[PDB]
């Protein structure tokens, strides 16, 4: 079973932890990857009720199991905060335009 289901993509907690670790490291070093410059601030326009405090940052999580290194980020993202706490896993899949919905 999936710990997180983003549309058709299935993620385990280990997938999320691995992605989050990579994104947080880049954040701490002040570096980015990809044309969209990940990780970058997640403004939470959607208004999700995260259990952890902001600021929030988003980083792609890939269905391939590999850590994002550039190129197309796909539709899924892990959101973490300044303390490297997981806020949630969200996706553009099933959402209009560039909006996000939470993975289940
Ligand atoms: N929907 C949404 N997009 C955000 C938010 N913060 C940053 N963005 C980024 O701004 C772009 C245009 O709104 C979105 O595609 C998204 O980039 P990502 O695709 O990199 O997540 C947010 O809180 N909500
Ligand atoms: Ca996996």
User: What span, in angstroms and rounded, lies between the C-alpha atoms of 50 and 67?
Assistant: 24
User: What span, in angstroms and rounded, lies between the C-alpha atoms of 76 and 52?
Assistant: 20
Pocket (CB within 6 angstroms of ligand 1) = 36, 42-46, 58, 77, 98-100
Retrieve residue 37's tokens. 């410059």
Active-site residue list: 40, 58, 92
> Which residues form the domain of 45?
1-104
* Specified resolution (Å): 1.2
Query: Per the structure, how many domains does the chain have?
Result: 1
Neighbouring C-alpha atoms within 13 Å toward the C-beta of 30: 0
Retrieve residue 26's tokens. 């880049």
What distances in angstroms separate CA 26 from CA 34, 48, 58, 93, one per listed residue? 12, 24, 11, 25
* Contact (Cβ atoms closer than 8 angstroms) between residue 11 and residue 61: yes
Q: Helix, strand or coil for residue 23?
A: helix
Kindly report the CA angle at 46 between 63 and 76, in degrees rounded to 5? 5
Give the method of determination: X-ray
CATH number reported for the structural domain that contains residue 32 in this entry: 3.10.450.30
């Amino acid at each position: 079973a999936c710990d997180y289901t983003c549309g058709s993509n299935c993620y385990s907690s280990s997938d999320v932890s691995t992605a989050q670790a990579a994104g947080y490291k880049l954040h701490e070093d002040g570096e980015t990857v990809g044309s969209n410059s990940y990780p970058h601030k997640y403004n939470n326009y959607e208004g999700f009720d995260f259990s952890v405090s902001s600021p929030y940052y988003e980083w792609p999580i890939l269905s391939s199991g590999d850590v994002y290194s550039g190129g197309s980020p796909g539709a899924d993202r892990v959101v973490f905060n300044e303390n490297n706490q997981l806020a949630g896993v969200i996706t553009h899949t099933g959402a209009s335009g560039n909006n996000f919905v939470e993975c289940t």
